[PDB]
Design a protein around this ligand. Structure first.
Ligand SMILES: CO[C@@H]1O[C@@H](C)[C@@H](O)[C@@H](O)[C@@H]1O
Ligand SMILES: CO[C@@H]1O[C@@H](C)[C@@H](O)[C@@H](O)[C@@H]1O
Ligand SMILES: CO[C@@H]1O[C@@H](C)[C@@H](O)[C@@H](O)[C@@H]1O
Ligand SMILES: [Ca+2]
Ligand SMILES: [Ca+2]
Ligand SMILES: [Ca+2]
Ligand SMILES: [Ca+2]
Ligand SMILES: [Ca+2]
Ligand SMILES: [Ca+2]
Ligand SMILES: [Ca+2]
Ligand SMILES: [Ca+2]
Ligand SMILES: [Ca+2]
Ligand SMILES: [Ca+2]
Ligand SMILES: [Cl-]
Ligand SMILES: [Cl-]
Ligand SMILES: [Cl-]
Lengths: 149, 149, 149
């Protein structure tokens, strides 16, 4: 009994793992996930940057980061409005870094941006043009999370 | 050996349970659930009120209920068309109650409504501009379910 | 007590099976699955027919198959562009068969189709007005999967 039931439950668990992996694949597919491409998702809610980071972290994703022109357009299409990107110069003013780590390998700044305007701007938003503007991290913009290809 | 295998399987189970809850969270987020707000969803199918109650119940949710103007608007944008709300005046005519208990607080009746028209109307539908109209529970309207915030 | 832990693990597994089934049901509902009707999903990616088949198969579904006008309309709405159907005459030229088996019955061919044009056309795409056209299985069209009623 004991050993047999234990062996069966191991098989029951592996079956459930396989099934959950399928559920995730189907949901990603339904979410527009393209083959071999990372995918962006939004609930269309606008919130401060800290909340966006906390939200994506919960979902085991990261705040969306465009690494090239295609991903930048992809993010733009998903958000439809201004949205925070996983980029900030919070650590050292003027030096924008990825929340995931490292210096920018790609950027699409609007003319004369980033400008740390007025009281200060350490976060980044992709606007209704695909272009970027640094803005207050306390301002509320669309939450867009990224998940791996 | 056996106690070690069992312990390892219990760990696998805890991990799988967390992964499923994550799947639930990402799905709700992808379908528009806002932080700290109830999740409203529809399959766009129109059916009698009894069927909407049975369907939402099966999904472990309930027929959508607007507790305030914000939720009323939220439901309005999910439904697109006329939809049943989880409210009825089946016990005492004119006394609308939530199907989950309690007397109706917030309301958004259309002019001349509720009129318990014809042979009687004890259900409620959210219609044009998010206003309400009592209607026969036998009529078919869009099924919208709500899940906790 | 080993047996007590095993019985709890059994209950944990059954609970998980029940919850995964609920998650699947809620997801199908959110994707527009109507009661007792099969449902359709797409990620809007265009690809050759063999890729669509592989993709849907992996998700435990099949390339969308319109069995009647209602389903045809539903697939058209979901796809929004030209998309492959789970129908081909690859096995015997002129005789279209469902990828899951059986000879084609209901059809919605555009005038003058199918025509196995040029070197040949053994696949089928739902196109404009929802009509059908046979086309090369090598061409890239939208991937649409169907899942059981
Ligand atoms: C003058 O500064 C520009 O306009 C302000 C209204 C802000 O949007 C700021 O981020 C931008 O750089
Ligand atoms: C006159 O009454 C109004 O029109 C009828 C056709 C019904 O829709 C009824 O619920 C509504 O209040
Ligand atoms: C003449 O043939 C028609 O036009 C060609 C350009 C193809 O689209 C073919 O499938 C269609 O039947
Ligand atoms: Ca700063
Ligand atoms: Ca700055
Ligand atoms: Ca700026
Ligand atoms: Ca009555
Ligand atoms: Ca009444
Ligand atoms: Ca009425
Ligand atoms: Ca042929
Ligand atoms: Ca010819
Ligand atoms: Ca042919
Ligand atoms: Ca043709
Ligand atoms: Cl800031
Ligand atoms: Cl009634
Ligand atoms: Cl072909």
């Amino acid at each position: 009994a004991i050993e047999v039931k234990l062996a069966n439950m191991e098989a029951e668990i592996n079956t459930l793992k396989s099934k959950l992996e399928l559920t995730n694949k189907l949901h990603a597919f339904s979410m527009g996930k393209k083959s071999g491409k990372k995918f962006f998702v939004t609930n269309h809610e606008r919130m401060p940057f800290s909340k966006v980071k906390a939200l994506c972290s919960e979902l085991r994703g990261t705040v969306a980061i465009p690494r090239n022109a295609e991903e930048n357009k992809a993010i733009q299409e998903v958000a439809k409005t201004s949205a925070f990107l996983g980029i900030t110069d919070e650590v050292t003013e003027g030096q924008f870094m990825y929340v995931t780590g490292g210096r920018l390998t790609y950027s699409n700044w609007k003319k004369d941006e980033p400008n740390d305007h007025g009281s200060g701007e350490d976060c980044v938003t992709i606007v209704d043009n695909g272009l970027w503007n640094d803005i207050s991290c306390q301002a509320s913009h669309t939450a867009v999370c990224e998940f791996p290809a």
